[PDB]
Specification:
2 copies of one chain form a homodimer.
Chain A lengths: L18 E2 L4 E2 L5 H5 L4 E5 L2 H14 L19 E4 L2 E5 L4 H18 L5 E10 L7 E8 L6 E6 L2 E6 L4 H14 L4 E8 L19 H13 L2 E5 L2 H11 L2 E11 L10 H7 L1 H14 L3
Parallel strand pairs in A: 3-5, 3-6, 6-12, 7-10, 10-11
Antiparallel strand pairs in A: 1-2, 4-5, 6-11, 7-12, 8-9
Helix pairs in contact in A: 2-8, 3-6, 4-8
The complex binds 2'-deoxyuridine (DUR) (2 copies).
């Protein structure tokens, strides 16, 4: 049995209208069950254009192809959203707080639509550590910049922490799907999630930087030693919030560069757009496989 | 005065790729493109910011196409008319922080001078009639402290988050020459979360009560806080660090002492979000006449 989507906030049951402000959707103007009740896979990534390309790429592989793919979030540009069959594709921008909003309103949408048996997957990009550019990483543990699998949030002035473990079973399943493809290297490892892309990640090419290359290396290698294989900016909340709500979730990012050799993203554009299809492809394999049982 | 960075590594690089802008030192002529820029405005929405550069252009008589300079990506949107640069930054400290790092570099590559950065944004109000525009005196964290904390190489760092004291009053004066809407100067709280992080009850997650919220928001009001948003802290911190004169002008979209949801008619909300645009336009008008 596929369990219903639950919230962890008793206030929503008691609201006469629930306005999903950043989606430009509302219970009083939209029928959630009719629009989303059949959704089973939610896919989320930073760029809206990427997540559109995804809903197109994926429609083709389940034979939905032809067609136009309307943005469900018309009347807003905070987030883009697309649906095809049981697959929802939603952008989330960059950074913990941007994705945190998307998730808050997303989960509520699933709860309103009365969805059940949903899987959430982040298809992102990252920087790798001691991996060839182009490798995809399936996250076991989202980790903070001190390598603790914790996510910290300040509520009413007090610090609260939730665990950022990702469903073990799903990472092993994803592992298998990538192999069925045999198209690109894929490892599982821990993902370090930061709040800054430059100083936040040992980079030497920001506007500010009070440290040396030798300092960047020491830090980055220490991270690798702790089981860390890539670096991005959303894995923590994603893990934390899904766990908080009992949702099955996973994170699949391609690395765009090996950080032990550089900071700047200087691959030909043609190569970087290939890199970014890898996670879409992998997740493509996962959904197709799942819809055959 | 010339824009600068506190980063020596940049001068040594054979090229500077601004990934999130889709802009490069070697595919792009920075001085040619941005050298004349005197006023940089930033905001969350790519729509609001296109709208802004359009409104400005007319108020300065440049009025009919406005090209997204950041075509080749959709991370951020960028526009230009005259000495006015308009930029999107999405939502949240890390999103604007990336925009900032790359923006500040861009300005240094164009070797601009006498620049002013302004975040024209939206917010939640505390004890302010909705539609009220706040001018940030002091960006502040969820503990009411004027510090911005950042982890670098595993170690904690904090920076002061005060905005230019002369610039805020100058903006207050400009809002007064307008006399179109209420403008207060107060402290702005900057949070990493819009829902649980801002004491809302309508999140997907929430284990407190309307009372706990009330007592928290009021504590903030007592601490001199008039609005809540999600960018002030970094924007402040980074500018101080690079010695740029910067301000934060935000329209309140609801009284957080009264509710959590953003319920007002699209008509009204649109009008609100034009207000900070109008003030900033004034300020630009003024600066050029002098
Ligand atoms: O070195 C990198 C490369 C990519 N990203 C992720 C997160 C961010 O939002 C986006 C930037 O391309 O992808 C990183 O965090 N670090
Ligand atoms: O109560 C509010 C209202 C608006 N915003 C701002 C900041 C953010 O980027 C966006 C969210 O609606 O607008 C807040 O942070 N809190």
């Amino acid at each position: 049995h596929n369990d219903l989507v639950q919230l962890c906030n008793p206030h929503i049951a008691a609201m006469k209208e629930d306005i999903l402000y950043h989606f430009s959707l509302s219970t009083s103007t939209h029928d959630f069950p009719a629009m989303f009740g059949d959704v089973k896979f939610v896919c989320v990534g930073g760029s809206p254009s990427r997540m559109k390309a995804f809903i197109k790429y994926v429609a083709m592989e389940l034979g939905f192809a032809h067609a136009d793919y309307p943005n469900i979030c018309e009347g807003t540009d905070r987030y883009a959203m697309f649906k095809v069959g049981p697959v929802l594709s939603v952008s989330h921008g960059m950074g913990v707080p941007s994705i945190a909003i998307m998730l808050h309103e997303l989960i509520k949408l699933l709860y309103h639509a009365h969805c059940s048996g949903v899987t959430l997957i982040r298809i992102g990009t990252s920087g790798g550590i001691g991996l060839e550019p182009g490798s995809v990483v399936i996250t076991r543990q989202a980790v903070d910049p001190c390598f603790k699998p914790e996510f910290e949030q300040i509520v009413l002035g007090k610090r609260e922490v939730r665990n950022t473990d990702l469903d073990e079973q799903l990472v092993q399943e994803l592992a298998r799907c990538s192999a069925e493809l045999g198209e690109f290297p894929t490892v599982v490892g821990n993902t370090m999630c930061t709040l800054d892309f430059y100083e936040g990640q040992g980079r030497l090419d920001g506007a500010l930087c009070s440290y040396t290359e030798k300092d960047k290396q020491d830090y980055l290698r220490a991270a690798y030693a702790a089981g860390i294989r890539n670096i991005e900016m959303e894995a923590s909340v994603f893990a934390a919030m899904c766990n908080a709500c009992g949702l099955r979730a996973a994170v699949v990012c391609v690395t765009l560069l090996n950080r032990l050799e550089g900071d700047q993203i200087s691959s030909p554009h043609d190569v970087l757009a290939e890199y970014q299809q890898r996670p879409q492809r992998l997740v493509g394999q996962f959904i197709k496989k799942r819809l055959m049982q």
